[PDB]
Amino acid sequence: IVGGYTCGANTVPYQVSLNSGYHFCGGSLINSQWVVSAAHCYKSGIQVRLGEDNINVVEGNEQFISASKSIVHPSYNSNTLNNDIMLIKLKSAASLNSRVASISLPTSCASAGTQCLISGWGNTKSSGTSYPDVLKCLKAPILSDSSCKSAYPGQITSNMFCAGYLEGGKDSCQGDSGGPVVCSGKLQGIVSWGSGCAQKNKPGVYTKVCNYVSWIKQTIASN
Ligand SMILES: c1cnc2c(c1)ccc1cccnc12
Ligand SMILES: [Ca+2]
Ligand SMILES: [O]
Ligand SMILES: [V+3]
């Protein structure tokens, strides 16, 4: 997260770190047994880390639970990043309390202009590299479909939305992938892609979670 702020420990209690020996992506806890992340975050050997603030120190609220199964969306296209969503089933159920809690799926899509909370442990620089140990946060508005399409002509599908600031300075970045975009208490986005980070006229692009609730529910119903 470039241009954000330190969230404060366990104030984003649905935020997960995906670990394969190291943090490589975020995700969102949607119930005691399932995490939503980006399909482009797929890898084998994932451990889900819940209750994290500093990802390099055991602070006392963590739950570390291995994935038993990962399910990339059937129509995920890694070339276009269309349908950039994946479900991760936990080997054992998370214990839900104030420091670890699920985030609700949407019933309806979010509106443009809605201020959302984006979070993660990604790069905090738009040029150069600096990775934070504690969870970073960013408040960012959903942008119009037309502004999004103007920013990335020929690249935005109906399963994507832009959020952020056309002036630059504030964005998600490398290592935030797969993490939440929460608007009015619903998981509306997943950190997907952009063109650099925090550049003028290049806002972040997010998977539009409201288009996947049927697939999520059906999948959870049978796995
Ligand atoms: C870890 C983190 N981010 C990424 C990947 C792995 C792989 C692909 C990709 C494409 C767009 C944005 N982020 C990532
Ligand atoms: Ca920790
Ligand atoms: O990334
Ligand atoms: V990334």
3-state secondary structure of 132: coil
Amino acid at residue number 185 = G
- Find, among 106, 119, 125, 163, the residue nearest to 10 by Cα: 119
Structural domains in the chain, CATH included, are 15-103+212-221 (2.40.10.10), 114-211 (2.40.10.10)
Which resolution in angstroms does this entry have?
A: 1.2
Tell me phi and psi for residue 70, to 5 degrees: -120, 140
CA distance 76 to 173: 21
Is 177 among the catalytic positions?
Answer: yes
CB 137 within 8 A of CB 4: yes
CA distance 188 to 77: 20
By what technique were these coordinates determined? X-ray
Is 176 among the catalytic positions?
Answer: no
Q: Tell how far the Cα of 16 is from the centroid of ligand 2, in angstroms.
A: 11
- Largest Cα span, the chain: 47
Tell me phi and psi for residue 155, to 5 degrees: -125, -15
Residues that constitute the known binding site: 52, 54, 57, 62, 171-172, 174-175, 177
Q: Look at strands 136-141 and 5-6 and give their pairing.
A: antiparallel
Can you list the alpha helix ranges (DSSP code H) found in the chain?
145-151, 213-221
From the list 17, 23, 40, 70, the catalytic residue is 40
Q: Tell how far the Cα of 97 is from the centroid of ligand 1, in angstroms.
A: 31
